[PDB]
RNA sequence: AGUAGUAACAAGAG
RNA sequence: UAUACCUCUGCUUCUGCUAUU
RNA sequence: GAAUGCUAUAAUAG
C-alpha cells in the first residue's frame, strides 16, 4: 500500500515556514508526583560539583559548609565551569561602560530615587512567599504581614513609616537580634451555653502565643528557600527543581533588578525587558543592521546559542561585584542597599523539601521519612540512585534539615542583572585584533551571537574565543543544543527567524480554552484571544471563525449551557429550556442562558451583553442586569462584612451581570488545624469593609496615612455626622447617640 | 442619614480585641497589605478548576443578603441552593442553576442609567453599527510593529490627571490636593457627574469605566496604514500579511487625523511621480483618485487649512491656494519671506552626546501663534535673530517663547538639554530629535531661559520686554520684544516646482520630507496598479510577480528587440524604490549583464528576473565606457531591503533542486519555464557586466578580486571569483 | 585581563566546532529498528482505527446516555444477548472470568428499565477497578525501625522496535469517510468581505476533515473524557457505566447514535489532578487480534457474534482493558477539538500565500484548480522506496491526524523528543537551504532526541519517519552538489 | 491490577 | 474503647522569578 | 508632521 510520512510536509514547505507543525501543544504538559527532594538534591550535588576545585571555609555566622568558587583555578575541560575571574568581569563591565557612558550613574540614579518612593506594599504582589514564622509557604500579602507583626514584637515599627528603605533597615537590624519572638497559634477549649440536653458546647478558639528562636535559627529561616519542582514544563522529558524566598530577601531583590532594567532598557542587544511585538521590531531592526554592515565578500554567521547550567554556576559574589561597579558614583548609603540581595544569596541556605517515601510491597505500607530524618535509616534501604545523592551531599547537610549552598543562582531572581552580565560578553565584539567581530542578543540565558569574518573557518576562531571569554565570567554555552550556519535563519527564545520572524500559531493555542474565571468573564477572554491571535500570530479568517466555534462548544459543556432550541438534557438545562420558550426576544439571551452566539471576525471586540443589549426583553435584561443581585455582591445596613477580595483592573471588558459570579472557596482548609486562620481572614476583612465603607474611594485608589486606621475612621464619620445634623440629614436624637458612641473611643 | 450605622457598627467591632488592636496598630497605608492577606493558594490550573467544579452541585458561592433568600431551596427536583455558608461570602452556596433560575424567574431590577454608564461599550458598537465595508484585496503587506492607541479616548490625560478627575466625580470629599488639572476639565466632571447622577451601579465599577475612556491603552501592534484608535480596535479585520480589507468607521473622525494621513499622501504620490516623465500629469491621475478613508484628498486639501510642501504641490497640481501655513506640533507658522534648506549636521547636545538633525540654513521670517497669543519670529542657522510677540494669556505666551526658541534650532537651545533625553525608543525606533525637545523643555523652561542670557528691554513705543515671570521688565531674553499689535497666483512645473509670476520658486518635489510613516486613516487609491505608492517589499514582490506573469512574451520580446520591452510602467515604480544616486549606475550594470546573456548565448532565466526591472533608469557607465559592477543592490529601507548579484537575498533567492523561486518569504515554481542546457550553465557569466568564465580557481592567479580590483582590469585579464560559499570560478574580461 | 586569562587558560577548553555534512547525519534511534525489543503495544486510552461503532438512527433530538446505550442494544439484541465467554486473548495479569462478568453486568445494567447507571461494588468490579490497593500510611518511627521497608527503584520506560500498526493508524486515520460528527456551533452572519471569504474558506476546510476518519475519533475522545469527567466529580463514590457513544451526520443528512462500547468508572476521590481513576473499558472491534499480536498484550478480547461490514460477514470481538486516567488528561481531553486550529491555520497559511502571488483568493484553486491554476499538491509519502504525491486535502487530513496523535500519544516523552529534534530539523534546512552550518557537539545533540525514544508509539514511528524523510533528503540533495561547478 | 514513569495515585480525615 | 452502615473533604500533599502589561 | 510608557487570575517565553 502508501504509506504516509507527514515529515514529507518539509519537502514542499521549509521547516522555519511550517514550524507550528514541530509544536505538539494539543498534548497535556509534564507534571511531578510525590517529592522535589531528589531533584532538589542533584541541584545542590552539581551546584557545588561545578564548584569543588574552589575556596572550601566553614560560616562563622550560620556554620555552614561554604565553597567558593570565584578567582578559581581555570577549567581543564569543556564540563560547566563556575570559575569566573573577577578581573574579566569588571574589563568586561569597562568596556559595556565606555560603549554606553554614563548610563551606570544613570540607571543608579533613577533606580534610587525608585526605591524612595516605593511604599513596603509593593512587596505584597508576589505569588507564594515562604514565611518564616511558620517555616512554610504563604501568599506574599500574608508572609509580609506575618513578619510585621513579627517585627513589632522586637520593637521594630520601620513597616509603620510606610516606605520600603525603613522596613528593608529593620530586615537587616532583625539579624543582631539575639532571639526573635513571633505569634503561632493555639486551640483553647471553652464552655458556651447553648440550647443542648446539658445546655453548653464546647467550641476550640485560637489564641496567639509568643514563640521565641535564637540569633542563629532566624538567620538561618532568613537565609532559607523553600524548593519545589516545575510542573507544566513544556518540552522537556525530566523533570527539575525550582525555589521560592523569603519576605527578608526579596525586598533587597526588588532594587537589585530595578536597576539592571534600567541598564538592560538601554542596551542595543537585550532582549529583556522588551517583550512580544516590541521586542519583535527591536530583534527584527537589530538583525537588519548587523547583517548589512557586513564586510562585502565575507561571511556573516549566526550562532543560534544556548547556555546550559545557567543558574547552577553564576556566582552571587560576582553579583555583588556587578552591582559594586555599576554604584561607582551613587552616594555611600545606596551602595550597601544594593549590595545586600548578592550577600544574603552567597550565604543561602536551601529546604530539602518534603524528604522520601519508603514502602514494602509485601505488607503494602508506605511512610514519608522527612529531610531531619534523612540520615535516619542506614543507605542500604535508599534506591542506588538517591542512595549516592544523599552520600555526596552529607558535606553540605545541615542536621535541621536543610543544605548549605553558597554558590549558584537557585532561586534565580536577577533576570535582568544576569542578562547585563551576558551582554557585557557580546561588548567585547574581538579579542587580539583577529580577523572576527562578534555581537549578538540575550535574554537572560538564551542568546544568539552574530559574527562577521572573511571566512567561515576565521569566523570558527572567533565563536571559540567568545565560547573561551563567556567561561572567564562563568557562562557555559551549550555545546549540544547551540549551533551555528550562515546568517538569515536562527532561534532565539522560541521565535523562529527566516528571512524575517515566522509566524508560529501552536505555541498560544492552549490559551484558545475557556480561562475558568467565570461565565461572563471567560467568555470575552475567549472572544479577545481569537481577535489578538488574528493580529499578532497569524490566524487566517476561516481559522478564525472556526476557533469562535470550537470555543462556544467549550463553553457550551463546560458551564453545561447549551442552545434553549437544543434537546440536550441537563440538570441547568431543563430552566434554560423554560427561559427559552418564556422568552420573545431570544436574540437577546446570552449564550449562558442558552441563547444563540452572534459573535463573528469583525465584533469580537465588543462585550456580548452590549451586544444583545437592544434586542434583550425588558424582564430578562432587568433580571440579568440587577443592581442588588447577589451572585455579583455589591455594598448596601445591618452587618454586611464578608472575606471580600480587592477587585482588580482586568484587561478584558465585560459587563457586571449575574454571570459575573464567585466560586465556593475550597473547604479542605475546614479540616486541618489552620481552620484558624479563617477567623484571622474575616478579622481583617471585617476591619477592611467598614474601612471601606468609611471611604469608598479606597476600593478604588490606596489610601495614604501613617496614622491609625481608627483614628481616620473616627474622624470621618465625626465630621460626616456633624454636617448631617447641621444639614438636616440627621436628628437630634440620633446626634445625641453619633457623639455619645464616638466619645466611647 | 447611613452615618448613625457605620458609627454603631464601629463600636460592634471594637468589642473583638482582635478587631480593636487591628484598628489602632495597623496604619492607613498598612490597609493596602491587610486587604490582600488571605488563606487560599493562588490557582495555577483555573481552566481545570473550572471545568471539575461546574460537575459539582453547588460551586458558586451567593452573598448574605435579603436577595439572595428571594431564590428558593430548590425548583422542580433542582437543589438551586444549599444551606451550608461559603467560606469566603458567608452566604448559602448555590448550584449554577440558581443563576439560570434568577434570569428566568427572577426580580425585574431597574436598569436607568445603564447606557450611559457604559457609554464607551455602545459607542464602539455604533462604530461597527454605522460602518461600511469596500473590497477585501489579496497581495502582499509589509505590516510594522508600532505603538498606537487600542481604544478612543473622550479626552486624553496622563494616569495620575485621570485619577484625580475621576476622583472630583466619584469621592469629592476624599480627593486631596486641588490640583490645576481639576480646573482644566471642570466641564468633563460636571457633564460626567450628571449623566452618571442617576445610576444604582456600584461606584467601584463607574471608576474604571471613566478610566477606560480616559486612562491611555498604547500598546505595540502590527499595523499597515491605519493608526487611529477607531481603525485598530478593528484591526483584526483591517488586512493580514497576504490581504486587506477597506473599512470605514462610524459617527466622527478628527480633522488632526484627517491633517496628518493627507500629508502622508501627499508624499507617497509625490514619491512616486518624480520618477515618470511628466511627473504633473500621473500626480494628477493619482491625486484625483486618491480616496482618505471615504473623502477624496483633492476635497481633503480643499477643506484642510494646513499641511507641508507636499500638501501645496498637489494643491497647486490640482488648482487649490496654496497655504504657507506650517505646524510644529502646538506652534503654527506662515512664511512671508525666507527660503528653508534642510541639512543633515551632528548636534552636540548640553549633556553631551551627538544626535543626527536636520538643520534649515538661511534667513527666514514667519507668523507665529500659540493659541490667543501671536507674533513674528526671524530665524536664521541655527540662531534666533528676533521675535516680536503679542499680549494675551500668560502661558499661551510662555509656550510660544519656548516652542519659537526650539523650532529656530539655536545652539543655545541646545546646550542648554540638561537630563534625560530619548532620541531613541526603547524598541531601538526612532523618535523625531526637534519633536522630542519640543516636549523636553515645554517642561524644564527655567533651565532653559538660565543657559539663554538677558539683556535691556526695548525702549520704544509699543514695545517692553518680559522677563522669566513672563511680566512686564526692565530685563528680557536675548532676541524677545513685546507689541500691543497683532493669495498670489502661483503655477506648478510639470517637473513638479511651484513656480511664482515673476521666476523665483516657492516650492519643488525635492522640498518634501523623505521619511515614509504610518498614515491614521485608511488612504486608498482608486485605480488599477494602485499598489505603485506601496512598501518597498510590497513593491519589490508585485513587479516581480509581473515579471514572471509575463515571462513568456517579456523573455521573448527581449531575443528581438534590445530596449523595447526595458520601458515597464512596473519598472518604472520598482525604480522609485531604488537610491536615485545609485539607480542609474544599476541600469548600467543590469542591462549590460542581460545583453551579455542574449549575446553569448549564455543565459540565466532567474538572474534574467532578478535584474530585468533594474533595466529602466537611463544607464550610468564609468567614464572608461566599461559599466559599473557591484556585489549588491542596496533600496529604500532597512539594511535588509536589498538584492544580491551572486548569492540570494532576504527579497529574492533561487533555489534551483526544487526550482522554487523565494520573493520576500512567498513561494513560486520556476518548473516549465526554464532551458534543459542552464541547469549546469554557470553564474559565474551573468554576475559581472563584460565577464565570462573561463576554467575553476587558478591558485597561480592568487585571491579573489574585489568590484574595484575587477573593475580596473584590461580586457583578456583572467581572475579569480567566488559566487555563493565553496564555489570558486575563473572568469577572463 | 580577558586577553591574558585566554592566554593562560588551557587550549582543551573549546567549542571544537565541525562543518556539517549529510554524512554526519546518522538515522536518530538505531535500537527501533533492533528485532530483539519488543514490538511497542497499543497504549491509547480507547481504540482508533479499530473501533467499531454499533449505529443506531435516532429521532436527531437527543436522549439520556443510558437510553441510547439501551436502544442501541435493543437494535444489536444478538450482540447484547451473547452471554457465553469466547475468550481469544488474554491479557497477562487480567481475569477473564471477572472481566467478562464485568461486562455483563454494565449490559444488563445499561439495559434495565431503572434510571441509575450505578454497578454493585461486586467481587469482579472491585478487583477491575483496583479496590483498597493503595498502601497504608504509617509514622517515620515505625517505618525507620522497619529494615523491610525500603525505597524503590523507579520505574523506567521500557525500550521497544518500531511497529506498523502506528504506520497503519496514521494511514487509515488521515482517510475519508462518509460520516461526519463535528459538533460546530452556529456563527453570526457575515457582513465584512473578510467574514464572506473566511466562510467559503471553512467549507473546504471544515468539511475536508469532518469527512475523514480522524475527525470522529477526535470527537469520540472529547464526548466520552466529557462525561467521564462529569461523572468522576458528581459521583465520586458510586461504580458508574458510562457509555463510550457519538453522534454522526451521513451524506443523506440523517443523525446516528455510535455505541462503541462500555466503560466502567471506579472510585474516583480525586483530591490531586493527576491523582488516578480507574477506567476499565470494554469496546466493539472487527480487528482479529490474533492477526498483530504484539500489538495487544494489554487488552483482553472475547469473539460476540458477527455483523455485515457489506456483503461480508465479519466477526464482532470485545477489546476488554483496565485503564486509567487523571484530572488534567479528561480536562486536556474536553479541549482536544483544537486539533482543528493548528492543521486548519498552517493549511491557511499556504493558501494565503498563494493569493498574495496570484491576486485573487486561491482557495478554490488548491483544492481543485481553476480556469486559471491546477491543484496543489503534496509530497505525501511512500510506495515501495518511490516517493508519492497526494492532494492539499489529504495534504490537510495528515497534518490534523498528526495533531490528533500529539494529544493522544501526549506524554513527556514526546515534548522532550518534538522539542530536541526541532533542534535538528533546522540543521537540515540549513543544508537545504546552502546555508553551509556547524556543529560543536553533534552527539551530545542526538543523546538528547535518542534518550527521549522509548515506549512512545507515535514518538517510535516519528523516529522512523524521520530516519525515511532524512534518507530521501540525502537523495534530493546530490542534485545540488554540482551546481555551478563548470 | 492499572495508570503511569526517576515518584506517585489506586481516597483522606475526625 | 465507643458513637461510626455516622460526619467532613476533592488545587492547600510546600507550585518561584521575570517579560509580553 | 513626532510623540505621550506602563503594569492582571489565563497562556506563552526564558
Known amino acids: ?745 | 442619614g447611613m452615618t448613625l450605622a457605620k458609627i454603631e457598627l464601629l463600636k460592634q467591632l471594637l468589642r473583638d480585641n482582635e478587631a480593636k488592636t487591628v484598628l489602632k496598630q495597623t496604619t492607613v497605608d498598612q490597609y493596602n497589605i491587610i486587604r490582600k492577606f488571605n488563606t487560599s493558594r493562588i490557582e495555577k490550573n483555573p481552566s481545570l478548576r473550572m471545568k471539575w467544579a461546574m460537575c459539582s452541585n453547588f460551586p458558586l458561592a451567593l452573598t448574605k443578603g435579603d436577595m439572595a433568600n428571594r431564590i428558593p431551596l430548590e425548583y422542580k427536583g433542582i437543589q438551586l441552593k444549599t444551606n451550608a455558608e461559603d467560606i469566603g461570602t458567608k452566604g448559602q452556596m448555590c448550584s449554577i442553576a440558581a443563576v439560570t433560575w434568577w434570569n428566568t424567574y427572577g426580580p425585574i431590577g431597574d436598569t436607568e442609567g445603564f447606557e450611559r454608564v457604559y457609554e464607551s461599550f455602545f459607542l464602539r458598537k455604533m462604530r461597527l453599527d454605522n460602518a461600511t465595508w469596500g473590497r477585501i484585496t489579496f497581495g502582499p503587506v509589509e505590516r510594522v510593529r508600532k505603538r498606537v492607541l487600542l481604544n478612543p479616548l473622550t479626552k486624553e490625560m496622563p494616569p495620575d490627571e485621570a485619577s484625580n478627575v475621576i476622583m472630583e466625580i466619584l469621592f469629592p470629599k476624599e480627593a486631596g490636593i486641588p490640583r490645576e488639572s481639576t480646573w482644566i476639565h471642570r466641564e468633563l466632571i460636571k457633564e460626567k457627574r450628571e449623566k452618571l447622577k442617576g445610576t444604582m451601579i456600584t461606584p467601584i465599577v463607574l471608576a474604571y469605566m471613566l478610566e477606560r475612556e480616559l486612562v491611555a491603552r498604547r500598546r505595540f501592534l502590527p499595523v499597515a496604514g491605519a493608526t487611529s484608535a477607531e481603525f485598530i480596535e478593528m484591526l483584526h479585520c483591517l488586512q493580514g500579511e497576504n490581504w486587506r480589507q477597506i473599512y470605514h468607521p462610524g459617527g466622527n473622525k478628527l480633522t488632526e487625523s484627517r491633517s496628518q494621513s493627507m500629508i502622508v499622501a501627499c508624499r507617497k504620490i509625490i514619491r512616486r511621480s518624480i520618477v515618470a516623465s511628466n511627473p504633473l500629469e500621473l500626480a494628477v491621475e493619482i491625486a484625483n483618485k486618491t480616496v482618505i478613508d471615504t473623502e477624496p484628498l483633492k476635497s481633503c486639501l480643499a477643506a484642510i487649512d494646513g499641511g507641508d510642501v507636499a500638501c501645496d504641490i498637489i494643491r497647486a497640481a490640482l488648482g487649490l491656494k496654496i497655504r504657507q501655513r506650517q505646524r510644529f506640533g502646538r506652534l503654527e507658522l506662515k512664511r512671508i519671506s525666507g527660503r528653508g534648506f534642510k541639512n543633515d549636521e551632528e548636534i552636540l547636545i548640553g549633556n553631551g552626546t551627538i544626535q543626527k538633525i536636520g538643520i534649515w540654513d538661511g534667513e527666514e521670517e514667519f507668523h507665529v501663534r500659540c493659541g490667543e497669543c501671536r507674533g513674528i519670529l526671524k530665524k536664521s542657522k541655527m540662531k534666533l535673530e528676533k521675535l516680536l510677540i503679542n499680549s494675551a494669556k500668560k502661558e499661551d505666551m510662555r509656550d510660544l517663547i519656548i516652542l519659537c526658541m526650539v523650532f529656530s534650532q539655536d545652539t543655545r537651545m541646545f546646550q542648554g538639554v540638561r537630563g534625560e533625553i530619548n532620541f531613541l525608543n526603547r524598541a531601538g525606533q526612532l523618535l523625531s530629535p526637534m519633536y522630542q525637545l519640543q516636549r523636553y523643555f515645554l517642561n524644564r523652561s527655567n533651565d532653559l531661559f538660565d543657559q539663554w542670557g538677558y539683556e535691556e528691554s526695548p525702549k520704544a513705543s509699543e514695545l517692553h520686554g518680559i522677563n522669566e515671570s513672563m511680566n512686564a521688565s526692565d530685563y528680557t531674553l536675548k532676541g524677545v520684544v513685546v507689541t500691543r499689535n497683532v493669495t498670489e497666483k502661483v503655477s506648478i512645473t510639470k517637473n513638479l516646482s511651484l513656480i511664482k509670476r515673476t521666476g523665483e520658486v516657492i516650492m519643488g518635489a525635492n522640498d518634501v520630507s523623505e521619511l515614509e510613516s504610518q498614515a491614521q486613516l485608511m488612504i486608498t487609491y482608486d485605480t488599477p496598479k494602485m499598489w505603485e505608492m506601496g512598501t518597498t517589499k510590497e513593491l519589490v514582490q508585485n513587479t516581480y510577480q509581473w515579471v514572471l506573469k509575463n515571462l513568456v512574451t517579456l523573455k521573448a520580446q527581449f531575443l528581438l528587440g534590445k530596449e523595447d520591452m526595458f520601458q515597464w510602467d512596473a519598472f518604472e515604480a520598482f525604480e522609485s524604490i531604488i537610491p536615485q544616486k545609485m539607480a542609474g549606475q544599476y541600469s548600467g550594470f543590469a542591462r549590460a549583464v542581460l545583453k551579455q546573456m542574449r549575446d553569448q548565448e549564455v543565459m540565466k532565466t532567474d538572474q534574467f528576473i532578478k535584474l530585468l526591472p533594474f533595466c529602466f533608469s537611463p544607464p550610468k557607465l564609468r567614464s572608461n565606457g566599461e559599466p559599473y559592477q557591484f556585489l549588491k543592490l542596496v533600496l529604500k529601507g532597512g539594511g535588509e531591503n536589498f538584492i544580491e548579484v551572486r548569492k540570494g537575498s532576504p527579497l529574492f533567492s533561487y533555489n534551483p533542486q526544487t526550482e522554487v523561486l523565494t520573493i520576500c518569504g512567498r513561494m513560486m515554481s520556476l518548473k516549465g519555464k526554464i532551458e534543459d542546457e542552464e541547469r549546469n550553465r554557470s553564474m559565474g557569466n551573468a554576475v559581472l557586466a563584460g565577464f565570462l568564465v573561463s576554467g575553476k580557481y587558478d591558485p597561480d592567479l592568487g585571491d579573489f578580486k574585489t568590484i574595484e580590483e575587477l573593475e580596473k582590469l584590461k580586457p583578456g585579464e583572467k581572475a579569480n571569483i567566488l559566487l555563493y560559499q565553496g564555489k570558486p570560478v575563473k572568469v577572463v574580461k | ?486
Open chain 3, 1 to 486: 585581563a580577558i586577553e591574558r586569562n585566554l592566554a593562560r587558560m588551557s587550549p582543551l577548553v573549546s567549542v571544537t566546532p565541525k562543518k556539517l555534512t549529510w554524512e554526519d547525519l546518522r538515522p536518530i534511534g538505531p535500537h527501533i529498528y533492533n528485532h530483539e525489543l519488543p514490538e511497542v503495544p497499543y497504549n491509547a486510552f480507547l481504540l482508533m482505527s479499530d473501533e467499531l461503532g454499533l449505529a443506531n438512527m435516532t429521532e436527531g433530538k437527543s436522549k439520556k446516555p443510558k437510553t441510547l446505550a439501551k436502544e442501541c442494544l435493543e437494535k444489536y439484541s444478538t450482540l447484547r444477548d451473547q452471554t457465553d465467554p469466547i475468550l481469544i486473548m488474554k491479557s497477562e495479569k487480567a481475569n477473564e472470568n471477572f472481566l467478562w462478568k464485568l461486562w455483563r453486568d454494565c449490559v444488563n445494567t445499561i439495559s434495565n428499565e431503572e434510571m441509575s447507571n450505578e454497578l454493585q461494588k461486586t467481587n469482579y468490579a472491585k478487583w477491575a477497578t483496583g479496590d483498597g490497593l493503595t498502601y497504608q500510611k504509617i509514622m517515620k518511627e515505625v517505618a525507620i525501625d522497619d529494615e523491610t521497608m525500603c525505597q524503590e527503584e523507579p520505574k523506567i520506560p521500557n525500550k521497544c522496535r518500531v511497529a506498523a500498526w502506528v504506520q497503519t493508524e496514521m494511514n487509515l486515520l488521515s482517510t475519508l469517510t462518509s460520516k461526519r460528527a463535528l459538533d460546530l456551533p452556529e456563527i453570526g452572519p457575515d457582513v465584512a468581505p473578510v467574514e464572506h471569504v473566511g466562510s467559503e474558506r471553512r467549507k473546504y476546510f471544515v468539511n475536508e476533515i469532518n469527512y475523514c476518519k480522524a475527525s470522529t475519533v477526535m470527537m469520540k475522545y472529547v464526548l466520552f473524557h466529557t462525561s467521564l469527567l462529569n461523572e468522576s466529580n458528581a459521583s465520586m463514590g458510586k461504580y458508574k457505566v458510562i457509555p463510550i457513544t457519538n453522534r454522526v451526520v451521513n451524506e443523506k443528512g440523517e443523525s446516528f447514535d455510535m455505541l462503541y462500547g462500555l466503560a466502567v468508572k471506579g472510585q474516583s476521590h480525586l483530591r490531586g489532578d493527576t491523582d488516578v481513576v480507574t477506567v476499565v473499558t470494554f469496546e466493539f472491534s472487527s480487528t482479529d487480534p490474533r492477526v498483530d499480536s504484539g500489538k495487544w498484550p494489554k487488552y483482553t478480547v472475547f469473539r460476540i457474534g458477527s455483523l455485515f461490514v457489506s456483503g461480508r460477514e465479519k466477526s464482532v470481538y470485545l477489546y476488554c482493558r483496565v485503564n486509567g486516567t487523571n484530572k488534567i488528561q479528561m480536562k486536556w481531553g474536553m479541549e482536544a477539538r483544537r486539533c482543528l486550529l493548528q492543521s486548519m491555520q498552517q493549511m491557511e497559511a499556504i493558501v494565503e500565500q498563494e493569493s498574495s502571488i496570484q491576486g485573487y483568493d486561491m482557495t478554490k484553486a488548491c483544492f481543485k484548480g481553476d480556469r486559471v491554476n491546477s491543484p496543489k499538491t503534496f509530497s505525501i509519502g511512500t510506495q515501495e522506496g518511490k516517493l508519492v504525491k497526494g492532494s492539499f486535502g489529504k495534504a490537510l487530513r495528515v497534518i490534523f491526524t498528526k495533531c490528533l496523535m500529539h494529544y493522544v500519544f501526549g506524554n513527556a516523552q514526546l515534548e522532550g523528543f518534538s522539542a530536541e529534534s526541532r533542534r535538528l530539523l533546522l540543521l537540515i534546512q540549513a543544508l537545504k537551504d546552502r546555508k553551509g552550518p556547524w556543529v560543536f557537539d553533534l552527539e551530545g545533540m542526538y543523546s538528547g532526541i535518542e534518550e527521549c525514544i522509548s515506549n512512545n508509539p507515535w514518538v517510535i514511528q516519528s523516529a522512523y519517519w524521520f530516519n525515511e524523510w532524512l534518507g530521501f533528503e540525502k537523495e534530493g540533495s546530490k542534485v545540488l552538489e554540482s551546481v555551478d561547478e563548470i
Open chain 1, 1 to 745: 500500500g502508501m504509506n504516509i510520512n507527514p515529515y514529507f510536509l518539509f519537502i514542499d514547505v521549509p521547516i522555519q515556514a511550517a514550524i507550528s507543525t514541530t509544536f505538539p501543544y494539543t498534548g497535556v504538559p509534564p507534571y511531578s508526583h510525590g517529592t522535589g527532594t531528589g531533584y532538589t538534591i542533584d541541584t545542590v550535588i552539581r551546584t557545588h560539583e561545578y564548584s569543588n576545585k574552589g575556596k572550601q571555609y566553614i560560616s562563622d555566622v550560620t556554620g555552614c559548609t561554604m565553597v567558593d568558587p570565584t578567582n578559581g583555578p581555570l577549567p581543564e575541560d569543556n564540563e560547566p565551569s563556575a570559575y569566573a575571574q573577577l578581573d574579566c568581569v569588571l574589563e568586561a563591565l569597562d568596556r559595556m561602560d565606555e560603549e554606553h557612558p554614563g548610563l551606570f550613574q544613570a540607571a543608579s540614579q533613577n533606580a534610587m530615587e525608585t526605591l524612595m518612593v516605593t511604599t513596603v506594599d509593593k512587596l505584597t504582589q508576589g505569588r507564594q512567599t515562604f514565611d518564616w514564622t511558620v517555616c512554610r509557604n504563604q501568599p506574599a500579602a500574608t508572609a509580609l504581614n506575618t513578619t510585621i507583626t513579627s517585627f513589632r514584637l522586637n520593637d521594630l515599627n520601620g513597616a509603620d513609616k510606610g516606605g520600603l528603605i525603613p522596613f528593608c533597615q529593620d530586615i537587616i537590624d532583625s539579624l543582631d537580634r539575639p532571639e526573635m519572638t513571633f505569634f503561632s497559634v493555639k486551640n483553647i477549649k471553652k464552655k458556651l451555653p447553648a440550647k443542648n440536653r446539658k445546655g453548653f458546647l464546647i467550641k476550640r478558639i485560637p489564641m496567639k502565643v509568643k514563640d521565641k528562636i535564637t540569633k542563629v535559627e532566624y538567620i538561618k529561616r532568613a537565609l532559607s528557600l523553600n524548593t519545589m519542582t516545575k510542573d507544566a514544563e513544556r518540552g522537556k522529558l525530566k523533570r527539575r527543581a525550582i525555589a521560592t524566598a523569603g519576605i527578608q530577601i526579596r525586598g533587597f531583590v526588588l532594587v537589585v533588578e530595578n536597576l539592571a532594567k534600567n541598564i538592560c532598557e538601554n542596551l542595543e542587544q537585550s532582549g529583556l525587558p522588551v517583550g512580544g511585538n516590541e521586542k519583535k521590531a527591536k530583534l527584527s531592526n537589530a538583525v537588519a543592521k548587523m547583517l548589512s554592515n557586513c564586510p562585502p565578500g565575507g561571511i556573516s554567521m549566526t550562532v543560534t546559542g544556548d547556555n546550559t547550567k545557567w543558574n547552577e554556576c553564576l556566582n552571587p559574589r560576582i553579583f555583588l561585584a556587578m552591582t559594586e561597579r555599576i554604584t561607582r558614583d551613587s552616594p555611600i548609603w545606596f551602595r550597601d542597599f544594593c549590595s545586600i540581595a548578592p550577600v544574603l544569596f552567597s550565604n543561602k541556605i536551601a529546604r530539602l523539601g518534603k524528604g522520601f517515601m519508603i514502602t514494602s510491597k509485601t505488607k503494602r505500607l508506605k511512610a514519608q521519612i522527612p529531610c531531619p530524618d534523612l540520615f535516619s535509616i542506614p543507605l542500604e534501604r535508599y534506591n542506588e540512585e538517591t542512595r549516592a545523592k544523599l552520600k555526596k551531599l552529607k558535606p553540605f547537610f545541615n542536621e535541621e534539615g536543610t543544605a548549605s549552598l553558597s554558590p549558584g543562582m537557585m532561586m534565580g531572581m536577577f533576570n535582568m542583572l544576569s542578562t547585563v552580565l551576558g551582554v557585557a560578553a557580546l561588548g567585547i565584539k574581538n579579542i587580539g585584533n583577529k580577523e572576527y567581530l562578534w555581537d549578538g542578543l540575550q535574554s537572560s540565558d538564551d542568546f544568539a551571537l552574530f559574527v562577521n569574518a572573511k571566512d567561515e573557518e576565521t569566523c570558527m576562531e572567533g565563536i571559540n574565543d567568545f565560547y573561551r571569554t563567556c567561561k572567564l565570567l562563568g557562562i557555559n554555552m551549550s555545546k549540544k543544543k547551540s549551533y551555528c550556519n550562515e546568517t538569515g535563519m536562527f532561534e532565539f527564545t522560541s521565535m523562529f527567524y527566516r528571512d524575517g520572524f515566522v509566524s508560529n500559531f501552536a505555541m498560544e493555542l492552549p490559551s484558545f480554552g475557556v480561562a475558568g474565571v467565570n461565565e461572563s468573564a471567560d467568555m470575552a477572554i475567549g472572544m479577545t484571544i481569537i481577535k489578538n491571535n488574528m493580529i499578532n500570530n497569524g490566524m487566517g479568517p476561516a481559522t478564525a471563525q472556526t476557533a469562535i466555534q470550537l470555543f462556544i462548544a467549550d463553553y457550551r459543556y463546560t458551564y453545561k449551557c447549551h442552545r434553549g432550541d437544543s434537546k440536550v438534557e441537563g440538570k441547568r438545562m431543563k430552566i434554560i429550556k423554560e427561559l427559552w420558550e418564556n422568552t420573545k426576544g431570544r436574540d437577546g439571551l446570552l449564550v449562558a442562558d442558552g441563547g444563540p452566539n452572534i459573535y463573528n471576525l469583525r465584533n469580537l471586540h465588543i462585550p456580548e451583553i452590549v451586544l444583545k443589549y437592544n434586542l434583550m426583553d425588558p424582564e430578562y435584561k432587568g433580571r440579568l442586569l440587577h443592581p442588588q443581585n447577589p451572585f455579583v455582591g455589591h455594598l448596601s445596613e445591618a452587618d454586611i462584612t464578608p472575606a471580600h477580595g480587592p477587585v482588580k483592573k482586568m484587561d478584558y471588558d465585560a459587563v457586571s451581570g449575574t454571570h459575573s459570579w464567585r466560586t465556593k472557596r475550597n473547604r479542605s482548609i475546614l479540616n486541618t488545624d489552620q481552620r484558624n486562620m479563617i477567623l484571622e481572614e474575616q478579622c481583617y476583612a471585617k476591619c477592611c469593609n467598614l474601612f471601606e465603607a468609611c471611604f469608598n474611594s479606597a476600593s478604588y485608589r490606596k489610601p495614604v496615612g501613617q496614622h491609625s486606621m481608627l483614628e481616620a475612621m473616627a474622624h470621618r464619620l465625626r465630621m460626616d455626622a456633624r454636617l448631617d445634623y447641621e444639614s438636616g440629614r440627621m436628628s437630634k436624637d440620633d446626634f445625641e447617640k453619633a457623639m455619645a458612641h464616638l466619645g466611647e473611643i
